[PDB]
Short mmCIF file of C-alpha atoms and ligand atoms in Angstrom, two decimals:
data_model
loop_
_atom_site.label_atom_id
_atom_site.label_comp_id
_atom_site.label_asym_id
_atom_site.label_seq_id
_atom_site.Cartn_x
_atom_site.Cartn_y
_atom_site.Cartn_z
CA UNK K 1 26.16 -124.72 -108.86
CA UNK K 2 24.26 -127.77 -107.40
CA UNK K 3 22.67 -126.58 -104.21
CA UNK K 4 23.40 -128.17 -101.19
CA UNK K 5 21.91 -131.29 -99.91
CA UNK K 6 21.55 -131.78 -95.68
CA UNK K 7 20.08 -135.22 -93.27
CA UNK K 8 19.13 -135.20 -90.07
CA UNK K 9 18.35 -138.36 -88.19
CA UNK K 10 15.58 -138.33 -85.94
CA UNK K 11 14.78 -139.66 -82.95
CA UNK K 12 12.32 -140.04 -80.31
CA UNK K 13 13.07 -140.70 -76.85
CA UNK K 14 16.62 -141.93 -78.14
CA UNK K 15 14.87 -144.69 -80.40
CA UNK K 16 15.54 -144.08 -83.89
CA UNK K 17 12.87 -142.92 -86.47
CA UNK K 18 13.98 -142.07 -89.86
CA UNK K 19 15.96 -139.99 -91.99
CA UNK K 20 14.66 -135.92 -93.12
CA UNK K 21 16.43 -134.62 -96.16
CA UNK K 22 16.88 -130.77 -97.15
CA UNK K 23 17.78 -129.05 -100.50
CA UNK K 24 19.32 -125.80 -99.01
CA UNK K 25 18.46 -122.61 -101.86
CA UNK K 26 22.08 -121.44 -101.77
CA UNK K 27 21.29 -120.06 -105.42
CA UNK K 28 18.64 -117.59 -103.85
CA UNK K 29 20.13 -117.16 -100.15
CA UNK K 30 23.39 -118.15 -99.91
CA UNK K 31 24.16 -116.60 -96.38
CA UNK K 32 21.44 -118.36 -95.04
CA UNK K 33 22.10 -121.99 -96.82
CA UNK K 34 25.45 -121.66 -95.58
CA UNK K 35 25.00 -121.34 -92.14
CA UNK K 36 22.43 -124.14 -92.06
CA UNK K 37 24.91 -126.20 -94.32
CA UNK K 38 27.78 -125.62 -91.43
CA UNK K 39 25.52 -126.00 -88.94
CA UNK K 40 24.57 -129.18 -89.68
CA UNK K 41 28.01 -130.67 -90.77
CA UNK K 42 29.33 -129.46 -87.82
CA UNK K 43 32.43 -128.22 -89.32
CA UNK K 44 32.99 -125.11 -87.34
CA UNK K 45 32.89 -126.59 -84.36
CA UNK K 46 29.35 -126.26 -82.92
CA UNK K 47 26.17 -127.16 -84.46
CA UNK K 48 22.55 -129.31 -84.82
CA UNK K 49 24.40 -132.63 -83.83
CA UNK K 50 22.52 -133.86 -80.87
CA UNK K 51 19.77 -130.92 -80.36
CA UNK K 52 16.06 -131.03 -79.78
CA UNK K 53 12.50 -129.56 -81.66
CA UNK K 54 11.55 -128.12 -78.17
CA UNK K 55 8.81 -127.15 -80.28
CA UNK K 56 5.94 -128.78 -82.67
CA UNK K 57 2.41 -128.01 -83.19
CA UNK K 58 0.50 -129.90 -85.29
CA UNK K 59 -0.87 -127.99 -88.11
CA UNK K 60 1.96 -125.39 -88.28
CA UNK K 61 5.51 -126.24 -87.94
CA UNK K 62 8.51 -128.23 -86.10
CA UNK K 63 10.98 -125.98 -84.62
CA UNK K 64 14.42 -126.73 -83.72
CA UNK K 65 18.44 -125.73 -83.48
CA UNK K 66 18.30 -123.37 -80.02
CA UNK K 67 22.20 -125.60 -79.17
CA UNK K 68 22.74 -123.35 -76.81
CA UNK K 69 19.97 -123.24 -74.08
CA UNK K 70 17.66 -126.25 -75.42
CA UNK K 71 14.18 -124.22 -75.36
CA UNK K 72 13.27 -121.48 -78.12
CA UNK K 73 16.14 -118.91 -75.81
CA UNK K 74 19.13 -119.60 -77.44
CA UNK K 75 21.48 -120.62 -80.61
CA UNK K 76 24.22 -118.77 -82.57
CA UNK K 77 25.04 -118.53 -86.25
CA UNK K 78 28.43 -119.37 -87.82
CA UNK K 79 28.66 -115.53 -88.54
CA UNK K 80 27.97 -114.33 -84.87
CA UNK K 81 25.49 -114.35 -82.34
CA UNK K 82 22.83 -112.73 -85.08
CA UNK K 83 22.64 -111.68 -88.70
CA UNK K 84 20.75 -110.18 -91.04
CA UNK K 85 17.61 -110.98 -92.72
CA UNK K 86 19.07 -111.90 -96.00
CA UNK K 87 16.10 -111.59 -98.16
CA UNK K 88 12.33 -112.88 -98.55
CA UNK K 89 12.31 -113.92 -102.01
CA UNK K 90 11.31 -117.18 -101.00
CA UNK K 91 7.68 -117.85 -99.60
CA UNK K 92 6.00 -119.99 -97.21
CA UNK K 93 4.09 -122.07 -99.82
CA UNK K 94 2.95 -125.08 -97.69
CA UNK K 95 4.19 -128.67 -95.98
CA UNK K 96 8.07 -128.88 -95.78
CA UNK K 97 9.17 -125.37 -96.15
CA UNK K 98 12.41 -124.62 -94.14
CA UNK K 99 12.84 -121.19 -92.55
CA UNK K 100 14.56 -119.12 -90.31
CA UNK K 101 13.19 -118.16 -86.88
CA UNK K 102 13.67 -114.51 -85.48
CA UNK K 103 13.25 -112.27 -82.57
CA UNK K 104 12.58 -109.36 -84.59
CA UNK K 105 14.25 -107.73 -87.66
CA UNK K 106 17.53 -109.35 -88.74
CA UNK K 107 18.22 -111.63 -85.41
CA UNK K 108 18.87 -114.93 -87.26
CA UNK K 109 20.68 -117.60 -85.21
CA UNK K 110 20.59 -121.01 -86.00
CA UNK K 111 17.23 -121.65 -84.73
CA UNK K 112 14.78 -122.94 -87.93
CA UNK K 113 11.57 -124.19 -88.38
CA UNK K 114 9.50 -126.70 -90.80
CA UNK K 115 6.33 -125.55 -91.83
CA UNK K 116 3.66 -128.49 -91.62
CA UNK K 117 1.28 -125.94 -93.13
CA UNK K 118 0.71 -122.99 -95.41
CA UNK K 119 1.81 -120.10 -93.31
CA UNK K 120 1.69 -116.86 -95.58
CA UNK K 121 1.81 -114.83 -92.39
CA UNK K 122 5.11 -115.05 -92.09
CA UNK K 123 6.20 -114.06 -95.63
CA UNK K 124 8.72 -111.10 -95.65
CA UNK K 125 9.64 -111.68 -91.89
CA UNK K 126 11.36 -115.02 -91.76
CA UNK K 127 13.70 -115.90 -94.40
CA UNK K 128 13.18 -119.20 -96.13
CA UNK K 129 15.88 -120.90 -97.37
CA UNK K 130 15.17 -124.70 -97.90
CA UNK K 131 12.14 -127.47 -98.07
CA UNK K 132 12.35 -131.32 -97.46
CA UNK K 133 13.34 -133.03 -100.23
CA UNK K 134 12.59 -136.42 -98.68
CA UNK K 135 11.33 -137.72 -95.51
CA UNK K 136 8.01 -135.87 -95.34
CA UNK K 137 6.78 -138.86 -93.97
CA UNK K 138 9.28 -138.64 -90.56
CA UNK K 139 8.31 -135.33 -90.50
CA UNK K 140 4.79 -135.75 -90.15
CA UNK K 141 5.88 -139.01 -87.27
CA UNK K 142 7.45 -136.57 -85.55
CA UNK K 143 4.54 -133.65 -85.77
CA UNK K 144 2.46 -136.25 -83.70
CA UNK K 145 4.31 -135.65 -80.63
CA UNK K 146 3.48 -132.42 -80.27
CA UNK K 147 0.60 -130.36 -79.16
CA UNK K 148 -1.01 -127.24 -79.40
CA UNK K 149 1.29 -125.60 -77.01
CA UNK K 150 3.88 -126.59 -78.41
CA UNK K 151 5.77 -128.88 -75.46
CA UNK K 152 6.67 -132.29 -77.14
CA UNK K 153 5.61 -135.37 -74.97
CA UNK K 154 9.03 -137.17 -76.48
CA UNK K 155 12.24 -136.02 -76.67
CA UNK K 156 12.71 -135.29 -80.29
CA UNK K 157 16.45 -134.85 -81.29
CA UNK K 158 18.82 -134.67 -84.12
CA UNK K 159 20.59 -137.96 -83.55
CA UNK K 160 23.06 -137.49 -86.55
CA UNK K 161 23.20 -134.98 -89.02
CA UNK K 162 25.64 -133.87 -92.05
CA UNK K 163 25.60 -133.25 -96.01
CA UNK K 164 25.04 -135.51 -98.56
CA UNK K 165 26.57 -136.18 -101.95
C1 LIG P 1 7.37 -119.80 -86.50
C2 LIG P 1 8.64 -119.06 -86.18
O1 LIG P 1 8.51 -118.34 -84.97
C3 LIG P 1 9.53 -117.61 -84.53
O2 LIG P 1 10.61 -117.63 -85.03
C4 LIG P 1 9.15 -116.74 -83.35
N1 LIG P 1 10.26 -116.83 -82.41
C5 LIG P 1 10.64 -118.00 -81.90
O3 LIG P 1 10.02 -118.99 -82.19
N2 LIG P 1 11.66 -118.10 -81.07
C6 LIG P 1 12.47 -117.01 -80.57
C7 LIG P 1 13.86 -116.94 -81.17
C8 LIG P 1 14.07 -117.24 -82.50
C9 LIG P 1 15.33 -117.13 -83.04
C10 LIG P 1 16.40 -116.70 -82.29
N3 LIG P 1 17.62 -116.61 -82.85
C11 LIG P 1 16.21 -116.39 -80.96
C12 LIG P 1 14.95 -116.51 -80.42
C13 LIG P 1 12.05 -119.38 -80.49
C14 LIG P 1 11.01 -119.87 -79.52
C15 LIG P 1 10.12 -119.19 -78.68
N4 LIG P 1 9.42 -120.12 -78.03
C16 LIG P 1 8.38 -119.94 -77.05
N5 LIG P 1 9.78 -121.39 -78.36
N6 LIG P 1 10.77 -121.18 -79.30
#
């Protein structure tokens, strides 16, 4: 009943910054919480453990979870290479949402993004499926090392991550 709660541990050129938090809307997508949920414990073998954002702009989102070729090309779901667009119920309201990037129609991975911004452009073509329950704050540390390319000027991985409760 109780959705789903997910950490990752940041840090920044190895050096440790702080703890993110995610509720995971397993009541709305369930197909989509799941595979971030798996992901992130690491229990089917593969997984966030370890991986970079290769990309963060200020003012729009932190993007992460390509495992598999470190840089926005790669990444695999627990369900195959790609699946489906579950649905958009969900919206991308503002600061903290969590959502699925694509390539296209229904080629979800296990790359992800978190919005720093509103960005209602992307409603009905990336599936959102989570927000930052706490750590906004590391979030927003970790915006700072991007830039408006995107290319971070620290190494910004996902030291630890798993599920709490
Ligand atoms: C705000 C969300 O944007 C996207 O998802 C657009 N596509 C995307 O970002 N990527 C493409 C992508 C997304 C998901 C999968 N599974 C494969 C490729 C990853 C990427 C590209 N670049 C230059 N840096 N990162």
């Amino acid at each position: 009943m109780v959705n789903p709660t997910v950490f990752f541990d940041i840090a920044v050129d190895g050096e440790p910054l702080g703890r993110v938090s995610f509720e995971l809307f397993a009541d709305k997508v369930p197909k989509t919480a799941e595979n971030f949920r798996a992901l992130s414990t690491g229990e089917k073998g593969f997984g966030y453990k370890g991986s970079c954002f290769h990309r963060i702009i200020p003012g729009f989102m932190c993007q992460g979870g390509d495992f598999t070729r470190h840089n926005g090309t790669g990444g695999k779901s627990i369900y195959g290479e790609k699946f489906e667009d579950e649905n958009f119920i969900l919206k991308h309201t503002g600061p903290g949402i969590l959502s699925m990037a694509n390539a296209g129609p229904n080629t979800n991975g296990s790359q992800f993004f978190i919005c720093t911004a509103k960005t209602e452009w992307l409603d009905g073509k990336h599936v959102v499926f989570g927000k930052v329950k706490e750590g906004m704050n590391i979030v927003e540390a970790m915006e700072r090392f991007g830039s408006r390319n995107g290319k971070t000027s620290k190494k910004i991985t996902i030291a630890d991550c798993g599920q709490l409760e």
